[PDB]
């Protein structure tokens, strides 16, 4: 496994290299994102926080949603402190009822949306049948169908001006699965799914100004899981997260890997049947 | 677009060529499923119905379930008609509650179930906002959720035993996408993870017994969806998808596409230009009833 080991970080040191390289020659157009109305879930803490404050950098008005009311509240004091204009609401997003009541808050007291952030996540990391069949239920209804129910509230006004973006943080488990998280993948890739979905509909629908991103990043720094030992992919800081998305966006990138050399994991998948699967797998463990 | 529909024949012809010849250079071996007790959810009507059947000739004791009592006595009758012992049970596969029950009536009157076929399912074509949010809720408890209930009430002995085999019938829904099917091909990506973190979740904690197998189809003519047409894929019957999902169960196949060459499709997204996805759409021009704004 010292060769494999030392082949993959060559792989991965060209492919960094390599992209950086086509960002100078071949610069991707970068949109602005000012005075568009942000609506981001999960933003008191983590990659939702620290997305929220790039937004304020862009000058965008931000409409930040979170269960947790002190950490939203911390993170629009320092959105106010970047120069931007905020409103913090309490919502539960994996909750139907409280998403549409919290919509009709937003437009009578923001306006219309254009820009969403499907950010809010849930894990409760065991062995399916070490499981709770309530976390199951709570891992669907939060990263999932919570997208659901807030793309179909915000989606009629985007739709009525040809504007818009939506935004999916799935991650690098919507793609490729890791033991002890079977609910999660399952429904991270829910999510993906739901990204391409709405991406192919809204092209054969004929709405051109309505752009999509998907977020999906390895483990990041921010208390969501424990700590792991992976060897390969690298745990990343949340700023650098949070960096990644917003040069995504705006960029109109539709599918984001944090790190970006993720995609090479990804092709080496459809191309390994299958005694070469659990040799990579072992040099994370 | 003639050259592009000519290089698409000519990658299918040869994929279909290719596999022929690989299928005796190096055959799969064939396991035995009789006496196995294999419980097939959705057994009232096409793949469900006609996999039973497959499991009959098979000789395996068969457990099937569905909402429809009607239908699902109807298969067991034809079961029965090929030489197998068969249990009906009414059950709803997005209920978590008569599931949980309906499994402590499996064991006392059938005994433990060996393989399970996670085949039920639903769908309700519509662009996303032309869907009703019951639609989605149910799209989900039956497509994904269930799955989740059955398999932890069923794992438990198959652990035990190291021995069993959990089939997890998702669609080309689970891998690409269709407009006007936002739930369910969200749903059918789920299902596609299910199986793919289980399978992976088995071999790290040293379950060498019990397999895993994903069957995902192309359209199939069992009126599930309306007026399917498919210009590259064909309109599959659904006598032929249960005998493709009896041959991958048997040979330990864990990635059941029908038709097998559809993963041509699926490698060509992977390398996809951006400009040629879309001359492939329209070549392919899917059709098929759904709620497009009315
Ligand atoms: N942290 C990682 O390693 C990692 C890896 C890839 C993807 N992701 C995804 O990124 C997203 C954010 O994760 P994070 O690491 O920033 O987590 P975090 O714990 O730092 O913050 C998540 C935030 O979501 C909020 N939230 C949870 N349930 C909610 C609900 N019902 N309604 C509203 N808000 C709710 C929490 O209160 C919290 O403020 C999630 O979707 C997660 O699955 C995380
Ligand atoms: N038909 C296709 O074109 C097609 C394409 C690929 C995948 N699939 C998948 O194959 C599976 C079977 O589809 P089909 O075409 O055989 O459908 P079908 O309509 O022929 O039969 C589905 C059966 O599932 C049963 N069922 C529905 N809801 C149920 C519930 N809550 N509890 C128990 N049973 C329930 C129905 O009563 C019916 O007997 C589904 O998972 C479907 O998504 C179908
Ligand atoms: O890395 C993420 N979590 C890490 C864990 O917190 C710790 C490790 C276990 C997996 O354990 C093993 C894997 C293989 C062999 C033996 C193991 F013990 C998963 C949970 C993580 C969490 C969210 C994500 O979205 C993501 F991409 C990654």
């Known amino acids: 496994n010292i060769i494999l080991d030392l082949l993959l970080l060559l792989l991965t040191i060209i492919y960094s290299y390599l ?3 086509v960002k100078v020659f071949f610069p991707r157009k970068r949109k602005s994102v000012a005075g568009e109305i942000v609506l981001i879930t999960g933003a008191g803490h983590g990659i939702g926080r620290w997305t929220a404050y790039e937004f304020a950098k862009q000058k965008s008005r931000l409409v930040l949603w979170d269960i947790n009311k002190h950490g939203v509240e911390e993170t629009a004091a320092e959105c106010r402190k ?8 309490v919502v539960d997003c994996g909750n139907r009822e409280d998403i549409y009541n919290s919509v009709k808050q937003v437009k009578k007291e923001v306006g219309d949306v254009t820009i969403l952030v499907n950010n809010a996540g849930t894990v409760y990391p065991a062995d399916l049948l070490s499981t709770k069949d309530e976390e199951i239920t709570k891992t669907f209804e939060i990263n999932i169908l919570g997208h659901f129910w807030i793309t179909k509230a915000l989606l009629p006004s985007m739709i009525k001006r040809n504007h818009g973006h939506i935004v999916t943080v799935a991650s ?15 429904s991270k890739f829910a999510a993906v799914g739901f990204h391409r979905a709405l991406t192919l509909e809204l092209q054969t629908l004929g709405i051109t100004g309505i752009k999509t991103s998907c977020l999906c990043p390895v483990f990041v720094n921010t208390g969501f899981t424990k700590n792991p030992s992976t060897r390969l992919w690298p745990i990343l800081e949340t700023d650098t997260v949070a960096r990644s998305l917003i040069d995504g966006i705006l960029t109109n990138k539709k599918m984001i890997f944090v790190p970006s050399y993720y995609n090479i994991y990804l092709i080496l998948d459809k191309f390994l049947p299958e005694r070469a699967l659990a040799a990579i797998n072992h040099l994370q463990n």
């Not at 690098?172 to 399952?186: A, F």
Request: hydrophobic share 40%.
């Open 82 to 89: 970047l120069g931007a204009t905020v409103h913090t609401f």
């Open 19 to 21: 992209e950086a390289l």
């Open 172 to 186: 690098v488990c919507g793609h490729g699965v890791i033991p002890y998280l079977i609910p999660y993948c399952s």
